[PDB]
């Protein structure tokens, strides 16, 4: 505990935290600039290095954090997150998921974690309804696969297509002009299937929204 | 009551219930697989039999349930449901409505029945508004049939077309680009009809949503 | 008060009211049938007479009601309504507005008047916001007339076109694909005008909805 | 304080205020008429002068107001506003922003300032969520720039295009028919990116709406 106590005083420092939060904003701005073809032609090298750096520093940090916190660290969701997203950046999609390190600014900032925590908190109460929904979708996706998939493969060819189309219908997006009117040119009674779907899923959803009152 | 009491102890068992809930999930997964042309080519037979089985077992169950519960059974909405949906599956749409047996997982699970019951419960308070709405639609569907059906048969040819179009307008889906702008190319004052419709029906509806507070 | 008292006992009777409510539903069904070209070919005469009848009966009723109620009658919104809509039906749009007599079923039924009254009641509190809105639209409709009307006459040629388009944008219907993306092909900064419009009008509106709590 | 006190009694008068509110409505109506090509051909001169006048009067007013109120004036948001918008009108966009002087009717009317103040008041509580959102957009806009911008430049070519498209997706406008279905013709897994985006941003937003309860 001679050396370990010297570490723990660093990790707990506000400097360290202020230093990490710093690099987050830096790297965060860096990634918005890596977005420009122009900028990368002129400064892309300076940048890809500056990235290699921060992920170094961040890896050090986690390892430091893990010494100081031992098994407490892996019981911590905010750290687990921090862990997971740095791990990702160690490893061509993975190239893109590296951006999720900017969420570190949520974990790393208590103002923010509060909100996220506050919203995540409400979720459990909502879940039993979420399974109602999903049971509802699955039954309808199934029925819609076999009612309309033969003549309308793009939208209902497969269970997953039906799931997607039904999601879209639930958002009400182009549901009549784009989906149900076309359908009725072949299945005049398609409205018997989709109007009640909309009544239900967009009456549960309003009700599912309301469970937002916890926050 | 010698034999009848021996039955009732089976039907009340948690095994029986756990056994029925089981087959529901099984058959439920089965129907998602009956969705695949590939899967049915290779295992469609094993499946259509496995279905014949479960509906047997379920029919037995209801009959058992009916002995144990006598006239209490047909006073029970959850059982009435269970009844109705098994009956359906006994009897080419009926082929498709057989999927409604997966809702048995709502009746059969108390976690779920609570929610459904909880939401169904709110409905009565909402009804008097629902008749307001429907009176509103009917009056407008009528007026819109005779204002626009001649030049716009697809959308307003018939009272039912007008009902459907007005429903669609109520969801705000393509109401301007798809319906009212086209209409105004012939009836420049069509906005006098549809803007107030939207104000009302989408002010009742927000208000109809709010009666969700009971739950 | 010899004769007048004999009348008043009729008008107050539940028979009279039950009799009027009756004809409303009758005529109401009649108008849904006047919707069919087929039905009018076969029974259109029997119908147009049956209409002439009811409006007679209704005119009698109002006149009766007016004797019994004198200046109390014209202080009554439900009767004023009843008055206004029967007057209309006495007098080719007027032909169509005659359908508004089916709203008599709202006045004539207390279950219903309650709701309408209940919703109308909330409106006053909401009004000061409604003038905010309208001031907002007018300022923006003006600014949008003169920013985009020259190159986009259909949508912004006129103040009223701009009012209509902005209403449509407020409902979010096709606002990006149909309006603002097209606009940006000429006015790359059009989003500076429309995103804040949507933020405001669809933050007031949510807030205007909330004043629904009175009911 | 001999002369200064004589002024202050004018500025505090209800006449002055009633006089300024007057010109606002006048000029306000004037600008709706400056909208018509016809009207300007016949009366555009009388009008452009009448405008020069009011902005004179208004400039006088502010200067008066500033004498009476000294450094209190520039600490006042309603006056700062009044200031800013008259300044604008002193100075071809600026030509158009001159319409913002009609908002003077919000400052100048206490009925109105209350509402605005009341709504502005709620904003602070909402802000920490607004930064969550914006952090969310930026991360996704970035990821979407580099996932889809090459094959879909119009919508995702640039970080700002992605910001705009993601805003549009958040409003749910044409998100499936117009954006994500097209995308899936090339990137079959695009739904893995956009469905969760919609779940989050349209679960925060409902929650962000709810903070409306302060008012
Ligand atoms: C409370 C619980 C409620 C239930 C929630 C269940 C949610 C399950 C969603 C499953 C989505 C499956 C999507 C999918 O993979 O569709 C593609 C295939 C294509 O078949 P094909 O390519 O024709 O051979 O189509 C298929 O055949 C896949 C079939 C998988 C059935 C999964 C059953 C899970 C229950
Ligand atoms: C659940 C589930 O079925 O899995 C997710 C589905 C399946 O997607 P999938 O069959 O792979 O369709 C992919 C896109 N496509 C059609 C163009 C190839 O895709 C979905 O869109 C599911 C939508 C979520 C439903 C929300 C339930 C509440
Ligand atoms: C009731 C009439 C239902 C019905 O006719 O279904 C037929 C069509 C497909 O067949 P078809 O109309 O013969 O072409 O299939 C459909 O159009 C769908 C019918 C809607 C089923 C509604 C299930 C609600 C639970
Ligand atoms: C609180 C109560 C509020 C009132 C709620 C009433 C809701 C009634 C909805 C009735 C929908 C009728 C739809 C329909 O069948 O349209 C097709 C026919 C076509 O006529 P056509 O094929 O030309 O001969 O068009 C028709 O002619 C059918 C006419 C039926 C009138 C039904 C009147 C019920 C009141
Ligand atoms: C009520 C009522 O009128 O019956 C349901 C209507 C009538 O449908 P219908 O005339 O058969 O139209 C069928 C589809 N089509 C036009 C392509 C052949 O179809 C509807 O869409 C009624 C929509 C529900 C109104 C909700 C009232 C609150
Ligand atoms: C007020 C002017 C109403 C009006 O002009 O109706 C005419 C058009 C059809 O005739 P027209 O404009 O002569 O072609 O019909 C329409 O465009 C519909 C007018 C809207 C009626 C609004 C009823 C609200 C209750
Ligand atoms: C709290 C109060 C907030 C203020 C609410 C004001 C709402 C006023 C809406 C007025 C809508 C006027 C619509 C209209 O008629 O546009 C057509 C003409 C066409 O001009 P043009 O045919 O080119 O000759 O365009 C015009 O020039 C009509 C100009 C009328 C200006 C009315 C000013 C009222 C304030
Ligand atoms: C107010 C006001 O400006 O009057 C109503 C406006 C003017 O309509 P108007 O200029 O006659 O446009 C008629 C349709 N058109 C363009 C195809 C010929 O038409 C409107 O759409 C006004 C929309 C209501 C704004 C709600 C304010 C909160
Ligand atoms: C700030 C830049 C505004 C601006 O460039 O306005 C130009 C365009 C029309 O001119 P232009 O871009 O020269 O074609 O006009 C526009 O695109 C509209 C600019 C938005 C004005 C926003 C007013 C918010 C209050
Ligand atoms: C709680 C805080 C959450 C964070 C909020 C940040 C919001 C920042 C929005 C910045 C929007 C930049 C939009 C933009 O200008 O895109 C155009 C250029 C085009 O590059 P190009 O023309 O190819 O050279 O694309 C660019 O390269 C501009 C890159 C600017 C990165 C700004 C980083 C700010 C953090
Ligand atoms: C923030 C930010 O990135 O700046 C505003 C962006 C950038 O716009 P920009 O790259 O200039 O795109 C302009 C229109 N275009 C593509 C047709 C040329 O344009 C936006 O649309 C930002 C949308 C607001 C996001 C709200 C976050 C909560
Ligand atoms: C998981 C599979 C993700 C994936 O396959 O990404 C591939 C496509 C682009 O590549 P590709 O499918 O090879 O064309 O890129 C995409 O389609 C986007 C994949 C969605 C990433 C979701 C990130 C959520 C946080």
Coordinates of N, CA and C in Angstrom, one line a residue, chain B residues 8 14 18 24 29 32 45-46 56 71 75 117 132 136 140 145 164 172 176 208:
Chain B
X8 N -59.6 -31.2 -10.7 CA -59.3 -29.8 -10.3 C -57.9 -29.6 -9.7
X14 N -49.3 -25.9 -10.6 CA -48.4 -25.0 -11.4 C -47.8 -25.8 -12.5
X18 N -47.5 -24.2 -16.0 CA -46.1 -24.2 -16.6 C -46.0 -25.0 -17.8
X24 N -47.0 -22.8 -25.4 CA -47.2 -21.5 -26.1 C -45.9 -21.0 -26.7
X29 N -42.6 -20.1 -31.2 CA -41.3 -20.1 -32.0 C -41.6 -20.9 -33.2
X32 N -42.9 -18.7 -36.0 CA -41.9 -17.8 -36.7 C -41.1 -18.6 -37.6
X45 N -43.1 -30.8 -42.4 CA -44.0 -31.9 -42.0 C -43.9 -32.0 -40.5
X46 N -42.7 -32.2 -39.9 CA -42.5 -32.3 -38.5 C -43.3 -31.2 -37.8
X56 N -54.6 -30.0 -30.1 CA -55.1 -31.1 -29.3 C -55.0 -30.8 -27.8
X71 N -69.8 -23.0 -15.1 CA -70.2 -21.7 -15.6 C -69.3 -20.6 -15.2
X75 N -68.0 -17.0 -17.8 CA -67.9 -15.7 -17.3 C -66.5 -15.1 -17.2
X117 N -55.4 -5.7 -18.6 CA -56.5 -5.3 -17.7 C -56.3 -3.8 -17.3
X132 N -67.9 11.1 -29.5 CA -67.8 12.4 -30.1 C -67.0 12.4 -31.4
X136 N -68.0 13.0 -35.2 CA -67.3 14.0 -36.0 C -66.9 13.5 -37.3
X140 N -68.1 14.6 -41.1 CA -67.1 15.1 -42.1 C -67.0 14.1 -43.3
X145 N -67.5 13.2 -48.8 CA -67.9 12.4 -49.9 C -68.6 13.3 -50.9
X164 N -61.7 6.5 -44.4 CA -60.3 6.1 -44.4 C -59.4 7.3 -44.7
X172 N -52.2 12.8 -39.7 CA -51.3 13.8 -40.4 C -50.5 13.2 -41.5
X176 N -51.0 17.1 -46.5 CA -50.9 18.3 -47.3 C -50.4 18.0 -48.7
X208 N -57.9 13.0 -25.6 CA -58.3 11.6 -25.4 C -57.1 10.8 -24.9

